[PDB]
């Protein structure tokens, strides 16, 4: 079967992991570089950094983060959060990020997808799509889930691939922040609309949820606090998935 990836997402602010971790073994349990290096060592396939830093120091903070990370880890990583134009994306890729995540900026300027892909290849462009049900239809939301765009998920997925995106990071606002499981209905809805890899995001709670997400058609599964507060062990997760027929790297 098709190759699947386990992705750890690290929400960061001022070079600090937001709300820390339970990892006692680390010298600093809130250091995103050490946490990221540890995750790569215990079998995480890729990292996603999402920065929430204040606008004045954001650019410097994200560039310093990226440089420190690229130095310490040998697995691919994505950086995102408030990337609004090409020069911001370019700086981050050149400083060490393999991929950039764009969302609000992509919705408001779809050609930003094409602009980044044109210089760094489609594989450097992750379009994050935050979606939820509104009157029985999947709608795209921008500004950290605050704005209903009125654009159907069906339409945006197709457009995103057309513009030259390499991957879709699909977050279900309906499941994000809960531990009730991935939005497998949403993943199944998106799967036949695109040839791109789909990263399942939002709702991870136990190892079985990852199996369900991969059966739904996801090419990767992303989670944060379940890994950070050690509710799921990464090595146990991969062993479990491999046992039940998922093609994960051990």
Curated annotation (Swiss-Prot):
Q: What keywords does the record list, in alphabetical order?
A: Amino-acid biosynthesis, Cytoplasm, Histidine biosynthesis, Lyase
Q: Where in the cell is it found?
A: Cytoplasm
Q: In which pathway does it act?
A: Amino-acid biosynthesis; L-histidine biosynthesis; L-histidine from 5-phospho-alpha-D-ribose 1-diphosphate: step 5/9
Q: Impact of changing residue 130 to A/C/F/G/H/I/K/L/M/N/P/Q/R/S/T/V/W/Y on the protein?
A: Complete loss of activity
Do you know which Pfam families this protein is assigned to?
His_biosynth
The record's GO CC annotations read: cytoplasm
* GO MF, one example: imidazoleglycerol-phosphate synthase activity
Q: Write down the PANTHER family for this protein, in alphabetical order.
A: IMIDAZOLE GLYCEROL PHOSPHATE SYNTHASE HISHF (PTHR21235:SF2), IMIDAZOLE GLYCEROL PHOSPHATE SYNTHASE SUBUNIT HISF/H IGP SYNTHASE SUBUNIT HISF/H (PTHR21235)
State the name under which the record lists this protein: Imidazole glycerol phosphate synthase subunit HisF
**Gene of origin?**
hisF
